[PDB]
Structure formats: C-alpha cells, structure tokens
Design a protein around this ligand. Sequence first.
Ligand SMILES: Nc1nc2c(ncn2[C@@H]2O[C@H](COP(=O)(O)OP(=O)(O)OP(=O)(O)O)[C@@H](O)[C@H]2O)c(=O)[nH]1
Ligand SMILES: Nc1ncnc2c1ncn2[C@@H]1O[C@H](COP(=O)(O)OP(=O)(O)OP(=O)(O)O)C[C@H]1O
Ligand SMILES: [Zn+2]
Lengths: 731, 248, 422, 125, 99, 54, 50, 149, 60
Amino acid sequence: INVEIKKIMKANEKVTSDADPMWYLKYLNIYVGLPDVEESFNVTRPVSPHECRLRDMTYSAPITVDIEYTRGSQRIIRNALPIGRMPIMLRSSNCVLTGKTPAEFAKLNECPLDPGGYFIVKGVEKVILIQEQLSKNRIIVEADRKGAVGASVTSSTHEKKSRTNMAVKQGRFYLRHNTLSEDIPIVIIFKAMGVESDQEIVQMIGTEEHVMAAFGPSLEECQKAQIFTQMQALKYIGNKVRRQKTKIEEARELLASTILTHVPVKEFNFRAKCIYTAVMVRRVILAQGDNKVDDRDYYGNKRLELAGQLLSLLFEDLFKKFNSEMKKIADQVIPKQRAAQFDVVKHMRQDQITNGMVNAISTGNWSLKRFKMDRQGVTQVLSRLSYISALGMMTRISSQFEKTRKVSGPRSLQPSQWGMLCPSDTPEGEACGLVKNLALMTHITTDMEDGPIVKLASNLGVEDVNLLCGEELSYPNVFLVFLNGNILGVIRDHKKLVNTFRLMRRAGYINEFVSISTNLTDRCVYISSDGGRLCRPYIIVKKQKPAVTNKHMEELAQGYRNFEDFLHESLVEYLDVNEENDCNIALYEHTINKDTTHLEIEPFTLLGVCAGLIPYPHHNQSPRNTYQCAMGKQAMGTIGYNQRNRIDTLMYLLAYPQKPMVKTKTIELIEFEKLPAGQNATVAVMSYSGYDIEDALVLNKASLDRGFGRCLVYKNAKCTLKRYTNQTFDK
Amino acid sequence: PGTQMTLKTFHFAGVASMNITLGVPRIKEIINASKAISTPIITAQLDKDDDADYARLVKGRIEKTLLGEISEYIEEVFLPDDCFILVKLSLERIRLLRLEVNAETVRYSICTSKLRVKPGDVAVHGEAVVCVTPRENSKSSMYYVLQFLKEDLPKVVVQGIPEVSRAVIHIDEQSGKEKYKLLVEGDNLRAVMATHGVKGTRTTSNNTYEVEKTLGIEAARTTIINEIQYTMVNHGMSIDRRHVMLLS
Amino acid sequence: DDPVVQEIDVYLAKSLAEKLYLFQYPVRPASMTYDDIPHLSAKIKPKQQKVELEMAIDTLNPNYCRSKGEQIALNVDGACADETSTYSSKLMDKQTFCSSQTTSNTSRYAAALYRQGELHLTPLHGILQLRPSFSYLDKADAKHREREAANEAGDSSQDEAEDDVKQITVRFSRPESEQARQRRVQSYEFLQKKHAEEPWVHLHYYGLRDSRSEHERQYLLCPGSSGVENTELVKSPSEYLMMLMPPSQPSNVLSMAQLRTLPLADQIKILMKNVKVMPFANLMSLLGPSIDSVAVLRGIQKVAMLVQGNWVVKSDILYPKDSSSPHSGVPAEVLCRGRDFVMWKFTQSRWVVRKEVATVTKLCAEDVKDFLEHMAVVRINKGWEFILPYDGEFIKKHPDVVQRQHMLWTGIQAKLEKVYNL
Amino acid sequence: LPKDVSVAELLRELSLTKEEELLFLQLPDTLPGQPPTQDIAENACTLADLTEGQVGKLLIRKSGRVQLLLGKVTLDVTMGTACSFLQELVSVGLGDSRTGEMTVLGHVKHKLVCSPDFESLLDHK
Amino acid sequence: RMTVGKLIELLAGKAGVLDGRFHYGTAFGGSKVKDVCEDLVRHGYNYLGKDYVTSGITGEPLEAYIYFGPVYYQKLKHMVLDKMHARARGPRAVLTRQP
Amino acid sequence: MLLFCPGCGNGLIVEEGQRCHRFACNTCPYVHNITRKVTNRKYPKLKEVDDVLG
Amino acid sequence: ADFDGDEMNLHLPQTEEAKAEALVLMGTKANLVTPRNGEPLIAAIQDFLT
Amino acid sequence: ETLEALILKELSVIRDHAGSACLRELDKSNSPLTMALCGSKGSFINISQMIACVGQQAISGSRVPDGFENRSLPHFEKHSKLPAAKGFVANSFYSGLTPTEFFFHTMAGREGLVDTAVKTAETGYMQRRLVKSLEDLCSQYDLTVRSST
Amino acid sequence: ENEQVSRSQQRGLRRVRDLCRVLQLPPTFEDTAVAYYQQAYRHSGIRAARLQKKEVLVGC
Ligand SMILES: Nc1nc2c(ncn2[C@@H]2O[C@H](COP(=O)(O)OP(=O)(O)OP(=O)(O)O)[C@@H](O)[C@H]2O)c(=O)[nH]1
Ligand SMILES: Nc1ncnc2c1ncn2[C@@H]1O[C@H](COP(=O)(O)OP(=O)(O)OP(=O)(O)O)C[C@H]1O
Ligand SMILES: [Zn+2]
C-alpha cells in the first residue's frame, strides 16, 4: 500500500485514446486514506473492525487520486477524486489498531493479543495464505516419461511467461516451444542467433571428449540439411513458426523476445542467449551420464508469494481494465455525443475496483486474464475455534500442486525445511504434506534494486561474458556466476569472490537479504536477490568462537543494543537455504569444530507455533505430535478479551480455563498462558472398570459436577429485513 | 489384504538387488493381465546345478552381449587407400566370461538389420579383428556414414536373446547341497527354455501373458495362482488358496 | 610477506588512446596467425565500430579444391557479368571476416606493454571479435532467385510485349500509432538501415613483419622520469570506498548507527528512554570518548535524575503528555507522579515496599509492578532493591551536581507531600 | 599445461628471459582518483582522465601475493581467464579522414585482473 | 506409541504443583528428570510418581502402585450432542426422491 | 574425431578425391589430404564378470 | 474401531424377512470368523489379554 | 552400497544388543514388559526404542537421503557417511532425541502418514474393481460355481 | 424482456447505472432508479423526446 501501489500508478500514469488526439488523463499521485464507512449520507466516519464484523460490512478505506485531463483543450485538474475502496488489513500501517494501547483496544472492542493481519469483508474474516511455487528463470534438468533426461526453463518477465524445453529423444537436442509447429535442432537456433561457426558452437557447448561424442549427432543432423547461414536458419524457423521476409522477421522477433525472455538483448545481440543455451546444453550433457537429476522438492528453488504480491497483481489488472474501459467510453462518447466537451469524471466508475477487490477476497477465486492465472482457494475463513487455532492458521502455506496427483515427493518432509517450516505441524488427512506452517524463527525476503549488487560484481573482477568465447566455460577453474537466473559472467577462484561478497554484506554496503550460493558439481555461483526467499538468522562463528558473547547478551538484556545492532555489528546474519547448503552450522557450542561458520541460535525454534505447545516433544513420536497439532488447531478455549462482544456463527468457550503447569518458552512468547485452552486435572494412569479399553478414559461424576469440563456453545441467528424495488419493506 | 499391506521395501527376496514390484501394485498388474509388466522375472533351473562354470556358460548364452561390451577398442581408420572401422575383440575377456563368440560369429551378427550392410563389406583379417567398410546407399547417405556406424554399432547383439536384458546366477545353499539357478529380467520365456543347458521342464516366469502364449492357459492359471500366493505371503498375511483359484 | 623483489613501476600512455583496437579471433587458435596471409583492405566506421576485413587466400596450395572453387564462384556470381563480383577471378580468392562488438564502454580495459622494469598502460577505444562471415551464400541465394525469375519469365521462346504498366499504387503514409512506431523503431530492419546509413571507410593493412609495425610500436611508451609523484590518485581508502559504492540516495526502532548519527541531546534522550538505568561511566563509554564529559552531563541532567549515584530517566520522558497507562488508561500525569514517588522512596531508602507504594499512590498492582521492574529487582525477604549498586565515585567527582539533584529531590518531595498528603 | 600464477609469470618473463611481452589487464570501473580539471560529482575516473608519467607501482610480496600500489590504496592482481585463441593487438589510426593505417603492435597471450582489496578497505576504517 | 513425553510432563507438573513452580518442557532441553525427582523426594512423594493407592470399590490396597499426577487435558469441539443424528422418513430431494 | 576448417570453422567430412581420401568442408573449397594413418579410439567399458548372488 | 471419535451408522430394517435375514446371516455369533483364512477376528483385545 | 549395507548391519546389531540388554536388566512385574509378553499391545522393539535406543530411521528401505549438496543437513561435513549424519538415533525417547534425530523421525513419520493414508485410495479402487467384476458368481446346488449367464 | 428494447433505452439505462455507481449508491438505489426509468419510458411523450430530454429524464 505504500510503494507498490505508487509504482503501479506511475506505470499506468498516462492513458489516452486514439481518436481525437491531444486528449489524455494523467494521474499524479494515488492515496489510500484511513479506513472509513460509506454508511452515512455522503459522509465519512471512522469505523472499527469490531463494528464491521457486527454490521456485516467491509473494513476498507476510500482510494483517492489526483488527476489532470483536457475537456475542451483546457487543462482541468482534480486534487482529490475517489476511484475505489481497498480493504485495509488489520494492524497495518493505516489501520486504526496500530499504535494503540490495550486501553484503546478495549475502548474500540478489540483484543490486544489478536494476531491480526487478516481482512474483514462482509463480516467474515478471510486470510490470504502464503502460496508456494517454483523459482522462475531457472534451468531444471529432469527425466521425461520415457526416461529421456531433458531440460526445461520457464522464463517469466513482467509481461509474458514462456516455458521452453529441450529433449534428447533421438540423441540430438531438440528445442520445443509453444510458438513453434515442430521442435527444431539446437544447431539451427545457434546459427540463427548469429553464431554460425560450428567450431564456436562446439567450443561453447564444451571441450570434453564425451561432450563432443554426445554432440556429434546434432552436428551431423545439421550438416545433413542445407542450413549454414543465419538467413537460412531464420527462414527455417519462420517456416516452422505457428500463425498468431515476414517469416524471417517473425522468427527473429520470437528468438529475441519470446524465447528466453529473462535473457536481455541490448540490440538484437544474442550473445548472452547463445551462452545461456550453451550452458544449458552442457548441463544436459553432464546429466546424461551420472544420474545427477535435480529435484523439485528442494525448497532452495521455491518462492513464497505473500498477500502483497497477489494484491499488487490484482490492483494492476483492475487498473488496466479500468483504463481500457475509460478509453472505450471516451472513444464512444467524444466523437458523436454533442458539441459539449466530454470528460472522464462523468464515467469514472468508483465501484469497479471496490467490487473487484471484495469478490477476489471473498470468493477466493482469482482470474487474471492479463497473466492467464486461474487460482482458487487463495482466501479461507479464519478459524476462530481458539487463539492457538487462529495463530496457527495465520502462518499456513499452501502448495502449487493443490492435490493434482499423489506424487508423495513434495508431500514428504525434505531436509531443506530445517529452521524454516515446522516439520511436525501438518494437517492430518488428504492435505498431509501440502499444507505447512512456518517455523518459530524465520523471515521472507523482499525484492531489492540489484544495482549495487551488479556494481560490486563488476568491480570484483567478473569478466564480461561477451569479451571471451565459450571455450573458457569448459575449464575446471572457471566458475560461472549467475544473477537471478541471468548469466552475470565468469570468474576464477570463487572462494575469494564469495568471501569478499559475504564480508561486504556483513559490513552493510549490500543488503543482508541478498543470498550467495556456490555449487561445485556445476561450478556455478548464484546470487539471489528476488523476494519470497526463506531466510533464518544465525550467529557468525570465526576461528572456533562465536562473535556473540556474554557481554553482548547482557547489553541486549539491559537495553543498550537490539537485534538490528547485532545485525549491523556483523554478529548475526541471515542465511538462505542455498547459502546454508554450502555453509556449515553448529547446533551447540560443544559441537563447534574447526570447520564451522555459523552457530544455531536455539534448537526448539525448529518447531512451529502449534508444535510449541507440545511439552517435551522430542520424547514422543512424530505421528503423536502431528495429531497433537491437528487437535490443538481445534482445541476449545478463550479467543480473546472481546469474546463476549464478539458474535460469530459458532464459538466454543470453557467455564474455568487454567494455564498449563508445564509451559514452554514458545507458550511464554505467544502469550498463550494468558488465553489457555484447557485445564490441569489429577489424572491417574491405570485400568478401571474396563471402560478405557481402546484410547477411552473414565471421568469423575463429582469432578464434572464441580464444574470440570463445562463448556459454552455460542451460536448466531441472523435475520435481514430489506427494502425491495417497490416502496415496501419486510416488517 | 490390500489395506492390510503397508507396501514395504528392502524385500529383495534374498539377493539384495533386482528391485521387483510387490504388493498392491503387483496385485494390480496381475489382475490387469497387461501384456508388458514392470520388472519381469524368469526363474530357470540348470541340468548341472553344482558346477559354476556351466552356470556362467548358460548365463553368457542367454544374456544379451553387445559388441561394445566385448570389444576393447573400435577405431575409424582412414588409410590413404580406404576408410573403415576396425573393432578389436578382447579374447581375454571373452574367455573369462566363457562366451562362445569369435570373429566369425561377430561377422555373422553384423549385416543384420543394420542399414543393409552387404556381407562383402565386413571382413576378417586377424583372429580378433573385424573390419567394416560401408558403401554409399544413395538414399540421402554418402561415404560419411562412419559416424552413424560408430553410433549404432557398439549396440549390436552378437550373442544372446535380444529380449533378455540382464541375467544373474542365484544360489540356494540348502544343507543337502548348494544349487544354482538363472534369474533373468527379461520378457521371453520361450527363448530361455529353448537355449541349451536350461531345464525347460522347471522354468517359471512372472509375465502372465508370456506364460499363456508359451505354456498354455492352464500354465498361465498356475503361474497366476503361485505369483499371487507368493506376493501375499511376502507380507506375512495368508489367504486360502480357493480364493485365488476361483479368481484365476 | 614483504616486497622483497620485483618492484616494477607502472606508466600511462595517451598517444594511442583513441587509435587502439583489440581484434580477437574466437575461431583461430593462437598457434596459427594471419601474418603470412596477404590482406587486401578493411572497411570500418568511426561511429558504431564494426570492422570487416578483406584478405586473400592462396590457390595453388594442395589444401584448396579448384573444382569446388569454380562451383562456388559460378554459384555466387554470374557467367561473365563481372560488374559486381565478390571474386576477381573464377575462384574463391577473398575471405570476409565480420566484427562483433563485445561491450559499449571499454574504458575499464587497457593494454599493458611489459618492458624491463616498467609496465606501460594504454587505454582501448574498442574491442571486437572477428569471425568468418557468410555473405557470399546470401548473394548466391539472391542470384538463384533472380535466375529462377528469369527462367519463369522466359519459359516461352518469344515473350510478347507485356502490358504490365505499373499502376499508381501510392499507399498512404498513414499516421502510425505510438506503439506501432516504437515497434518499427525497435525492429531489426530499422537498426540495420540506420547502421548502413553511415558511410564506410577503407583502410590498408600493415602486417607485423612490416617496418611500420616496429616504427609505431614505440608510441605505447611515454617520455618521463622514473620516479614522479602523481598529482592525482591520492584519495584515501574511505574516499575510494565511497566512490566505488555510492549510497542509494517499540522505542528501540533506531539502531546504534542511526542513534550516533543524531545530536548528543537526542542520543542521550533515546538511550535513557530505552534503558532507564545506566551509570555516567557506562553512558560515556557508549557515547564515545571523543564527546565531552561536560556536554554529556548537561545532556543527561535535563532528561534524567540522580538516584543513589545512578541516573534514572525522568518520568515525563517515558510518559508524554498525550500518553496514558497501557493497562489502566489513567492519564500520564498520575503515572509521572507515581514514578516520582517511587524514585523518592528509592532515594530515601534502598528497600521499597510494593504494598506501601500501592497503598500510598492509590494505584493498581500492574502499574506499581512496572514502575518497580523498570528500576529495581525482586529480593526475597527484603522487598525491592535497586538494580545498580551505590556509585559513590560520581558523587565524589561532581559535588555541585549532587547538590543540584538534592535540592531538586527536596522540591519533588515537597510537591509529593502536598499532593498525596504524606 | 599447469595453471601458472602472476608472480611466477613475471619472474620467468623478467629473469629467465628479457624479451618484452604484451599483456592485457582488466582494471576496476572507478580508480582511486579524481579527474584532473575535467569539469567534474564523484563520477568514474578512468585512464582517459589521468595524465602520463608514473601512476603506480607493482609489488610482489612473499607467498605469491601480487599487489598494485596506485596511491594510498592497494589493489591485488590475479590471473584472468586463460585465453588460448588468437588475440592480435592492433592500432587503427585514422590520420586522414579518407585513409588510415592499421598497425599490428603484437600478440596478446596472458590476461590479468586487478581488483580492489575490499578486506583492507573495510578493516582500515 | 512411545509417549514418554506424557510421563515426563506429568512428573514435571507434579513437581511444579508441589514446589510452587512452573517447569519448562522446551524441546531439546527443559527441566531434566533428576531435578523433578529431587523435588519429589524433598517434598516427601515418590521419586517416580507412583504412590500408594487404595481401591475405592473393595476398600483393599492395590497390588501395584498407581501413577498419579497433574496433566493438562484440553476438550475438543467434537461433541456427541452435535454428532448425534437419527433420520426418520423426513423429506426428500426433488430430482431424486431420496433423503 | 571432430575436425573443423581453419578458414571458416565448419565440420569436415571424409571424402574421396582424385588422388586420395581427404577431409573437406561443405561451405568452402578447403581440403586436406591424408598422408599417414589416423585413428580415433574410444575404449568402450567392457562387461565385468557378474559374480554369483547369494 | 479405536474409540477416538469415530462415527458409526445404525440402521433399523422395516421388514420381518429382512430382520430375520440380518439376524441369521449377519449374526455376530455366526460371523466370529473371517472367510479370508478362517481366523477368528472377534476375540480378546487390549485390557483383556493382559 | 556395500558400505551402506555394512553400516546398516552394524546399526541393527547394536540395536539388537541394546534391546537384549534392556530385556535382561528389566525386572519382572514391569507393565511394558508384561504387555509385550502377553501380546496385548507394544512389543520388545518398541520397548527397546523407548528405553534402550531407537533404531535406524529407514526411508524407503534406506538411510536418510542427502537433501542438500552431498549431505543431509548443513550441520554435518560434506561427503560424510556417518551413522549420526545419515539417520542413526543414538539417544532414546527417555533420554531425549537430538534435533537431527527428531527431524529424521518426523521425515520417517511423514513417509508413514502419506503411505498409509493415500495409498488407501489405491486399495479402495482395487476393491471396487474386483467386486464389480466378481459380483456375478455364486455357488449352485450341483456343486458348480456358475456366472449369471 | 431485455430483447424488445431499443439502443436508445439501453444507452439510457447504462447511463443511469453509470451515474448511480459514480455516486456510490447501493444496488437497491440502482434497481429503483432503473425501475423508475423504465416506468417513465413506458410513456410515448418521453419515449420520443430529445437527447437532452432523456438525459434530464435519467437525472430526474
Ligand atoms: N469439515 C470440512 N472441511 C472442509 C470442507 N471443505 C473444505 N474444508 C477445509 O477447507 C478446505 C477446502 O475448502 P474448499 O474445498 O477449497 O472450498 P471450495 O471447494 O473451494 O468451495 P468451491 O469454490 O465452491 O469449490 C480444506 O483445506 C479443508 O481443511 C468440508 O466439506 N468439510
Ligand atoms: N481416508 C481414510 N479412509 C478410510 N479410513 C480412514 C481414513 N482416514 C481415517 N480412517 C479410519 O481411521 C483409522 C486410521 O487409524 P490408524 O492409521 O490405524 O492409526 P493412526 O491414525 O496412525 O494413529 P497413530 O498415529 O498410530 O496414533 C482406520 C480408518 O477406519
Ligand atoms: Zn571449412
């Protein structure tokens, strides 16, 4: 709501129509304002989330913007015009709950311990779960149904998304794209992308004996035909191109923009794309031998899209639709309406965006036609069964598969989930393995500018890939360096590069969220700077001694420093999955050896919110903990201090709730002791009367009479008396 | 029993290799009676089960042995008079594996479903040397076919059944005597029974379609019954034979 | 590791700064060079550097096929037209190497000529990759196309006069939309035409074996003394770092650096609001030794008070006028009065009773608990004790400050006795 | 052919032999200096702004360290990508607007890369 | 089920309710068994949780000691009153005349 | 092996001229006659002796 | 079953013939063994074997 | 694979010896031991796992696969095939499981859950097909099983 | 219905809806407005009127 909305408004700042030139509509700045209600007669009034829940309305703020247009060639400006309503998230920057004390929360009828972060539309509380997907702009080598070890890459840019594959079905590399009639050899594409020398092509593919032996068939198939020049290759490509020299022009355009969109070309300079496809073919050849097939379940290549990105995409799509509708209305009205000059303010529909947002948040089905994205189940009703239930449902993660096949691969627990997601917390049922929860200590990175990153990479001696041929890529000491899937270049002695980059990041000149990883099997150093990546804090260890000491901990306890000061003093740093894949971590101080770079902050943090309630979990079984979390997600107890004023369709409360005697540090952190969901009873483990044969238990009549286990079920009965079109009303 | 079974693993039947599909997937394949199954097994008995030499001999006879797996080097030599491919057969490895394969058998295997190479193209000079001199076929092919030859020649069958892909010598260590048998991961029981040294009277197979096509419908029924009983016993659960008999 | 030997000097030459190009052959190994290959010419352009070399290859050598040469010549050119021929004779004699541009800016690259005891650096104006171009094949394709057209036209023996007068097909110069105009500008044909619009310049080739090579090779050197202190290149490491990495542009939100970047007064105010208990020595150590003790004293005396040698933040600094109790909602004035009473009780006696403080201030339990935890700890069988010990060093060092704090506490005691009626 | 190092390369080029050699070094984007009277700003300072004369020294410490003292800071020189293809250094001087001269100065065999010692720049202040 | 964690929690809760404290069951740590055994033996109860118990029906002591202690039981929303169902003839569906 | 023309760099194929076999390109008149014997061994991995299982 | 919240169904026949058939064929005393292998499934369980 | 099998055999031998030692040192009248003897619930395997030592966590009949590059978790050295680094659980449920051991048990736990829970669909479909195919046969009075036709 | 309607009446209804939405009025107000517009259009004097007449009709 602060930066992305402004960027979208700047991208769509100017909109004009083809007919009647010199007419335009320029937006200057968009505002969201504070949450207001349109109940009063053309009057705004602050409304609270509790009042919204009670009245079954939406908790949104009026979206306003300033604009300037030309009615009759005379520029007319408007400093404040409403255009829609954006549902404001609770405890946000513009929300009324933020910056409030418990006294003000009580005055506004809201629980201070409420986690918030959910939207309120038409009275129901919806939460946007964190969607999980595969990392974009990355080569994935995998086996086909017939066992062929091929490669794939889904280049997704801000405009289009295209998945291009490469197969070795017949010993030669055939490239397949959705815009081609039939897959064509890779040598023809090489010749079409400027590089026509077979020697240069072979040097780019590789200089190894086995590489040449495996690539021979492709050269033979290419020589069989009469394709030897870029013109002939482009003609063949155009002939093989599907309908949407003209064919040559279309082939060149598809090679420059459509295929491998993530690889930029300065001016029809396909050098970078040629190097990229050569590296891809080299990886495919190296994989065709030893079965080093990459796995999809490796979360190091996963990206989590929070509600922010989804809302930004939805707002951009709705704004584009509104601009198109306004342009159409203008084209239809201005040329044949009347001498009276037409302006947009008379057709600036303010309900379009509001209805779009309300529907996208309520129904949960998101259909973005500009991106061809049809998702379902994005929003779910916040489970108010208990405070623990809500706090655990708020930190859930949905998968991209959505129960499309019982693969058992992604449903399994991968070692990559260390410290990021809770291993034991998982719903028991058909959604086992696809619905996960975040760990107690983790973070999700955002998008950076990458400017200083590229500058430092270029200054650290990274040689330009266009200055040297691809032969250097086959050397054992020359390691490639990639930046967000794009080939940043080559380098030698990657140890120095990685050390200097990490030292600079710790100093602070580079954002601490930029991850750097190195894979020796492929000799590739990846520099990740995109958002959605999972990171975890770790204490830096140097020469068998952590940087954090008792003095630092005492200063933190007294209040002289904070976690930000620790981050700035090169004491604690964030590590990504791909970074910890190469870095060494220690669990405890006694485990620290000579070959150690980081130290685990706390082990129990591996467990999630729902799992933190388990007292002594490492002494029990894993299915036990899973069932315990599943039952805690439905446990009965108090919701908040405003549970009496809260009116829901179904609520369960306990008469005499008591806090546990064996409470965990996670409980103390989440403040669950203040809102317990159970009671401590003097249980005696034994068999009595044979009424506890299979998991059953025997209760005491007197204990139940004295108030033990007394529960309260609160239901809501709603009735509506509305006025119809005619002047009549239900009475 | 489908629900009672947990689909365990590590059940190599005592060989610690040759992963075979057993459990609910195997029962599914059996009830489907597909012509081609996954990981088919063929158990064959030997006439001389106490001698390992004869066992390895029959193994080499039945197992497919490619030219590149026995030749120590294949070189495309372009002498100033002519170009040809010279294959050097490793007689040492041949006699170690006990394969009755020589230059004559290699020449006979060549010229079989290989771009119609005439007998005059292949020649023999030494005891373990094979010279192949192709010729332009005029069907969009020229003298530069030595590449395709180098590509598709090492994968030519010189001895063994084309259908058989792998064969191993299993040993039973009964206190009475230690016997040997052949476990073939192929889909051709007729060839295994026809090969010399194989006691075809006691040869069993896992592929119901092959059993039906070779030994008849009664043999297929008996094989289905035995396979279902074995797959059900592997999981420790027993079922009355009458159910499987009625199913078959 | 010290520089025992090899103390070589570095000099800079600007004679061939704008006349030095780096042509590299990705397809020609370093073993075989073009020194023996006679060159013919080189087409170049000042702007948008793209050089195309035209050389000559031998024919009488055994590594040349005369029949295929005649074939390719007859395919690329006509029978005896010879008005625009890629080859003078009927054989492939000339070869075309086209240049590809690696990068736009080549200022960071420099050629280093090494001599005995010195290394001369000369900037490069351009770097190009020369590769064998295939344009004779395109010309042969055009020749075949026109030959097929001529054959289709002359399919008959005698072609009658065709009345194919070119009608006036003058198409409209329609106003191209902005999107279509941008597409046309970004089209490859437009860029190719723009590059071709620039005229070519022909240059002669001088091999390394020529005397001109050794004659001009000396320009890479510069006349200068051995030891000369350069006027520039005297910036400090901090300045160099700032150059090579220019900038982009609870109450503990501000970090240590963001705090130090603020004035001393704001620094002390934030430190006190955060900690609420800290000795003067600790405050000095945290702020730094470069700041004056009198300045730190003047800054702390306005936002803190002296309690048993230690400094405690004032109550109004923690509780602004517009704030309220987060637990009871009472105004900030009552909280300030209660905190002042607590501090006075602590100054009068080291042991303070929570029950007595509550009964006096008429406040709830949670507020008193917070006030006591902010500046004391729990002790069994003794009540609440001050978190820090008695610091007599500061009291002995600053007697005037002690008297000022004593009179201030006396005034606060008078106010408390007037308000609560102690 | 084992991978050589800059120290041994300079040693065998100076002591074992005396013949001159053409080298190609890649310098950082911005040098630790200011454009002398170039009309500015903290912009990039390349060799095009510096004048002739002694600009820096090349030191070789023990253990194979090769440093470049270009003022108050000290960069480090390392061996770049070992290029094996032909690299001919030429100067194309357009003495006249109609005809010029292309002079082949020599051949390039080795490649060097100079990088700032960021560790030193950070531990200094 | 190998739920030794439940026994550890029960022992810790007993020690806590006896000594007026709150034991911690932090994962990969927390209060050890020795501390709670020391607390029990100091307060006079058995160091293993088992205590001498007498049968309430027959009034005679049991041959085996019973394992008593405080455990944090939580009730779930699944109620038999809500899950109880009994369908008479009742209505049917319009398309297909079935319940 | 895989040979390339020093002139253009395209693949060379073995053909028969008027005097002796030679490597030639399909895009230039460059050729190269064979003087001595040329060989390209591959050393395919032989089948190891599979020992008894049990 | 394990008495962990499982919901089971209960049906009441509406015909004397169906009642008799359910009592005879589906009798608990007559179906003490499974037709798979004849092993008795209705026997002692935990808290009874011990 | 030979080293893998040898390590698995050594771990199994250690597990069996620990279980035997626990069964021999445990005194009679013990409730777990009596229940495992009478067969009501539990077994010596579970007793040894919860008292003596937990067995090797086997995923798909093998050790814990290397999720990261050449190692299961970053806390172990690269190319390290140690028991504790590949899945061995030295501590028991009574003494407490380390983080890596608990993670491997949960991984094995997840495996179990998915297998049994979603495999069942497989058996449901198989049973549906088998019944729909075999619901036509019946025993006649002449001792001949005949179909509907 | 919605088939025996002319383009002029359709434009009038669309303008009514557009203005009702610009004023952020509820769908009940939108329905009442379209109903009154149809009731007024039922008459012939307003049916065959001016463009400004029908615009003011939407407004009223
Ligand atoms: N108890 C219960 N829970 C459900 C049911 N359906 C869904 N859930 C829960 O909430 C989820 C899925 O709800 P959906 O199936 O997405 O609702 P929907 O199918 O999208 O509604 P439609 O869009 O009309 O198909 C799962 O994660 C379940 O945990 C249901 O019928 N009963
Ligand atoms: N998808 C399903 N299909 C059929 N039955 C199911 C399904 N889900 C649950 N059940 C019923 O619940 C029972 C499953 O329990 P079971 O798996 O044997 O114990 P568990 O859930 O592993 O408990 P522990 O984790 O061992 O304590 C058996 C079955 O009748
Ligand atoms: Zn050639």
